[PDB]
Amino acid sequence: PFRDARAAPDPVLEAGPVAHGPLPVPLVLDNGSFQVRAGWACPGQDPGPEPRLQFRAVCARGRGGARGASGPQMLRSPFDRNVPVNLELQELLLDYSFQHLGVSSQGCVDHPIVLTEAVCNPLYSRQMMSELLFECYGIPKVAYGIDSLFSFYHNKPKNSMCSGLIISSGYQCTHVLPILEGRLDAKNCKRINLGGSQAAGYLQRLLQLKYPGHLAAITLSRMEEILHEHSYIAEDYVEELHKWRCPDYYENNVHKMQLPFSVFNLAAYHQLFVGTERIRAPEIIFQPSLIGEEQAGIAETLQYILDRYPKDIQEMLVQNVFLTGGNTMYPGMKARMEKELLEMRPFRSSFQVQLASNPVLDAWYGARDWALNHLDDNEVWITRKEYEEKGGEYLKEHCASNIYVPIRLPKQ
Amino acid sequence: RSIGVRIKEETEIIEGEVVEIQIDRSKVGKLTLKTTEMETIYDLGTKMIESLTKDKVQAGDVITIDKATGKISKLGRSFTRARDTKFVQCPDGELQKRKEVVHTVSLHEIDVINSRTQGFLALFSGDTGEIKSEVREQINAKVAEWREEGKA
Amino acid sequence: TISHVIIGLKTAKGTKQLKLDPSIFESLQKERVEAGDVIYIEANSGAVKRQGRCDTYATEFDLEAEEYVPLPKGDVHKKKEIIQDVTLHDLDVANARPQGG
Amino acid sequence: KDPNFVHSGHGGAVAGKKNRTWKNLKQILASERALPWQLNDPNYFSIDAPPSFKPAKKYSDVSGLLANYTDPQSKLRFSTIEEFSYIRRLPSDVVTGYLALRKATSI
Amino acid sequence: RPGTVALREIRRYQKSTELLIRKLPFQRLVREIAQDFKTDLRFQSSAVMALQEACEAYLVGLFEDTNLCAIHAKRVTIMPKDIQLARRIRGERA
Amino acid sequence: PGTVALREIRRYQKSTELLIRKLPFQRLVREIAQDFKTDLRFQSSAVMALQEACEAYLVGLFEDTNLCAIHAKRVTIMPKDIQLARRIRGE
Amino acid sequence: LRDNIQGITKPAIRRLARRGGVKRISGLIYEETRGVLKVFLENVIRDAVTYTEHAKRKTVTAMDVVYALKRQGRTLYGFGG
Numbered sequence A: 001p002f003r004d005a006r007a008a009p010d011p012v013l014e015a016g017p018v019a020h021g022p023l024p025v026p027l028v029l030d031n032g033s034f035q036v037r038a039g040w041a042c043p044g045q046d047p048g049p050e051p052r053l054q055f056r057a058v059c060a061r062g063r064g065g066a067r068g069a070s071g072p073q074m075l076r077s078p079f080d081r082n083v084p085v086n087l088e089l090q091e092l093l094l095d096y097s098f099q100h101l102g103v104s105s106q107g108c109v110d111h112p113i114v115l116t117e118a119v120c121n122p123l124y125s126r127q128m129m130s131e132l133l134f135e136c137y138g139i140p141k142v143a144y145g146i147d148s149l150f151s152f153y154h155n156k157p158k159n160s161m162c163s164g165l166i167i168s169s170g171y172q173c174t175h176v177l178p179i180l181e182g183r184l185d186a187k188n189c190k191r192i193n194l195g196g197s198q199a200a201g202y203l204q205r206l207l208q209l210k211y212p213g214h215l216a217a218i219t220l221s222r223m224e225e226i227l228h229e230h231s232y233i234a235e236d237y238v239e240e241l242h243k244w245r246c247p248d249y250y251e252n253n254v255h256k257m258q259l260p261f262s263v264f265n266l267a268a269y270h271q272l273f274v275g276t277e278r279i280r281a282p283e284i285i286f287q288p289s290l291i292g293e294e295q296a297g298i299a300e301t302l303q304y305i306l307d308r309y310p311k312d313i314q315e316m317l318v319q320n321v322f323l324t325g326g327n328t329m330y331p332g333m334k335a336r337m338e339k340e341l342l343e344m345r346p347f348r349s350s351f352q353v354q355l356a357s358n359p360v361l362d363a364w365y366g367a368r369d370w371a372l373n374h375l376d377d378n379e380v381w382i383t384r385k386e387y388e389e390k391g392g393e394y395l396k397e398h399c400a401s402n403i404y405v406p407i408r409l410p411k412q
Numbered sequence B: 001r002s003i004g005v006r007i008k009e010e011t012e013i014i015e016g017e018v019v020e021i022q023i024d025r026s027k028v029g030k031l032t033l034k035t036t037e038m039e040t041i042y043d044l045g046t047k048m049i050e051s052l053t054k055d056k057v058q059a060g061d062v063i064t065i066d067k068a069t070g071k072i073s074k075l076g077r078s079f080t081r082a083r084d085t086k087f088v089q090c091p092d093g094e095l096q097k098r099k100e101v102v103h104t105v106s107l108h109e110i111d112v113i114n115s116r117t118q119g120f121l122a123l124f125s126g127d128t129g130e131i132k133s134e135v136r137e138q139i140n141a142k143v144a145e146w147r148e149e150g151k152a
Numbered sequence C: 001t002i003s004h005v006i007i008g009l010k011t012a013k014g015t016k017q018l019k020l021d022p023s024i025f026e027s028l029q030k031e032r033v034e035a036g037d038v039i040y041i042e043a044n045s046g047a048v049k050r051q052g053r054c055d056t057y058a059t060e061f062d063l064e065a066e067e068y069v070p071l072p073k074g075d076v077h078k079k080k081e082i083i084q085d086v087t088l089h090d091l092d093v094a095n096a097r098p099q100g101g
Numbered sequence D: 001k002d003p004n005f006v007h008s009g010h011g012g013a014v015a016g017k018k019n020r021t022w023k024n025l026k027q028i029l030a031s032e033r034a035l036p037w038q039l040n041d042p043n044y045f046s047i048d049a050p051p052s053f054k055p056a057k058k059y060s061d062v063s064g065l066l067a068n069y070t071d072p073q074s075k076l077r078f079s080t081i082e083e084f085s086y087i088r089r090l091p092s093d094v095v096t097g098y099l100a101l102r103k104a105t106s107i
Numbered sequence E: 001r002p003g004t005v006a007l008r009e010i011r012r013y014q015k016s017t018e019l020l021i022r023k024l025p026f027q028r029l030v031r032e033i034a035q036d037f038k039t040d041l042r043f044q045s046s047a048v049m050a051l052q053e054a055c056e057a058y059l060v061g062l063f064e065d066t067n068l069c070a071i072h073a074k075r076v077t078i079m080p081k082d083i084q085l086a087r088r089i090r091g092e093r094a
Numbered sequence F: 001p002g003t004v005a006l007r008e009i010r011r012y013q014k015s016t017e018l019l020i021r022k023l024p025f026q027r028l029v030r031e032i033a034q035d036f037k038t039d040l041r042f043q044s045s046a047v048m049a050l051q052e053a054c055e056a057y058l059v060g061l062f063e064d065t066n067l068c069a070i071h072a073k074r075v076t077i078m079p080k081d082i083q084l085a086r087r088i089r090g091e
Numbered sequence G: 001l002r003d004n005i006q007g008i009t010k011p012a013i014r015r016l017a018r019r020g021g022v023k024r025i026s027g028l029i030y031e032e033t034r035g036v037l038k039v040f041l042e043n044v045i046r047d048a049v050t051y052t053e054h055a056k057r058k059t060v061t062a063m064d065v066v067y068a069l070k071r072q073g074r075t076l077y078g079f080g081g
């Protein structure tokens, strides 16, 4: 059968840690349309033991006058299309995270922080986010970067001017990130508007249409079992759905987990047979025309960005295709990706596909190991005295982070 | 003439009653086909559009389409459209069948196909004469490898 | 105008670009070849054959008079030493009468 | 205790027919167009991937097997003889569902 | 809890050959309307329940036309003026 | 100005004769009859009974399309207003 | 030639529209109307011929079409029957 989810962890702490040399340990925080992930950096230790608040970033409140329902225990979330675009829920999300991390004594957030932002972040959203971060929370200095570049910075061979493609996936997007000598080539980076939410919503809608006996019993929190544990991505899609065509393959390979139980009962508590369906929700990022929506998908975007470039700079970067975030958790992902890439490389040419050491957590460990090294790069971090003149759109172009564009925003 | 070569080949063949056919002024158009057990609509391509229109295919015909080649064979009309000759029932099973055809050619009948800019006319008309022995020296050796690569 | 034609090729093993002699491109046009066809080029002889339309285009129309073939699983490019046997009689025949041409 | 006891008015109002939320994403990528953007910029309008260059494959709605066929009545796409017998029994409430799941010619 | 999945109604009231109006209130509705033409009426159970089947089918048939009228008139919301269009173009509101 | 068409409405509503040209209508009637079946030929009264039924039917369609556009808060008709006027009639 | 139903002229369709009381007419409406006008004869001439084919006459009478119009629910006066 299905399991069910679990909640109410013990992230209860004293007001904060203290470490040798400069005393203020930085906070490391990831945004996330699926889940937020956070912690104190734990500097001077490599085996960073306790990331905390690894929680589904969706909230409510008790409208009868009870409590703010920020943490784990209809619903709203502070992100749209992977960019934060909210205040009235973003506040109680950050307050909840800061309660469990601890604040040292009073009505200001004492320690410096590193925080994730979108592959490109709309100028106004950084303005609103920095305005919350400095008007309300009052942090002394702040750093920004991308989950994908942080998880790459974690998985690099060396702390050097490496180059590659980063392939990223998550709730409402996947992005292809051409990085040249540590610099994101933002003029020819691309994204597809599909990923985890679309795959889960699609797998739901398939089972809603295929099994009209159980229409309220199936829900996204049950789709996540079959999506993250029973599904796999094809090595070649027409080759997998071809071998599903014969019943002797089907009945042996099909997954068959019962609904939660109380005519041989399964007409009410069905095994919800999935065979091609446990491939279709994975394929969405490769063929978005499995949904209605026309976009190139990962294979044609990967080809499209490469033919922007001279043939030598292709060969020296395609040596590091890195897989990270979200849907890259599917079993068989590397074996699909390297086949789709072999089909479009020059005939004898070499390439290598690298999968993250932990495709969900490595963004935090990347930002952590980054902050542990860049701790006193006082030119890199956005300092509170810089936000005292810079309007909140501002960014500084440090390694493993987004590209600033010189610009100014009217606000009153 | 009296030693045969035998081969088998697989063909995508479409067969059905044409329910409706539509065309426009490049070109685009739409076709529908029926068996006793299914129906479809289809987007046609240009080389089909020219074939269906050249051969005056009309709603209520029962037809075979050689999908690899664009050739149309018409078998008759459906009995329910026999009003206003040959009349026939719709095919059974699905529309598009990957039929296997076994075929045989006499070893000499390969010589005559090889002899002229079109060979097969000389097969029937008797113009085959003094067929060049170096051509047989090749064809016998070619068939001797098809025999053992297993393709014939 | 036409010094050469660049042609791009793909198989499940990779890709190449080739620089065709205009006599070979005249043969591509003889075979009515277009982008998305699957082609065999015999570069030592100038033989050219259309195998079929590539099956990535098999949904360009639901029903059209082309045969579609899977993207070749073989290498883009293949080499052999080959040894040709020809008799003096084959020369005496093939050069005596005007060829069919 | 609270990370702050008092807070700014970031753009959402106290009262009015006006929002308590800031501008939603659709208004952001509209209003951002007035700025002095250039052909070299990291502009968020430019990052959405191009349309597919090849024509899209067809897979049967009800089972995901490769579809050779489309029904004249419902306009769904199907693979096999028993699937054609199956689809003709389905209620319009799921037929429109499969069509909407692929933004079909009737939405 | 609140404000989600209105299709909870779509997925309940059309799973079988059910009727949506309760029987006792329908049986006391029709009789008052009937007697104005001619009084002293008595009714077969099989007569009264043959009315409701036609009524609910006709109401459903109106609403099927009605939501497309709203969509054409630039709305997701059906409103009384959609019925003013539909029932007159079918020739019945005349 | 762009509105004195409202005087055409009143003129063609005062008028009650048939509006399509008899020869074009008769040619179309015959062409549709002849590709349907062989040697069908029409008395003038049959072509007139056809044309009166056609033009009354189209006046009904235009009245129905008017109410669809008025309901859509328009002052203009587009082919979509006719396609509602068909589907709402069940045509 | 003008046999493409365009022989039902723009101003004639527009005059039917004006008797029908409609204001601004978009330029695709004439052709959409010609589509309806064909389909009305694909009902009426077709069934009228099934009444002509009751007697199997060469002449279509006003009766033959009035019977088709009667079964199609659009009865007509002045011709009788």
Ligand SMILES: Nc1ncnc2c1ncn2[C@@H]1O[C@H](COP(=O)(O)OP(=O)(O)O)[C@@H](O)[C@H]1O
Residues within 6 Å of the ligand: A030, A031, A032, A033, A034, A035, A082, A116, A117, A118, A146, A147, A148, A169, A170, A171, A172, A173, A196, A197, A325, A326, A327, A329, A359, A360, A363
């Ligand atoms: N298992 C998962 N399933 C779905 N999405 C996930 C999963 N793990 C991580 N993500 C995705 O990671 C994406 C980007 O990285 P994330 O950790 O959330 O940081 P950020 O949004 O700031 O870039 C998000 O869009 C989120 O949905």
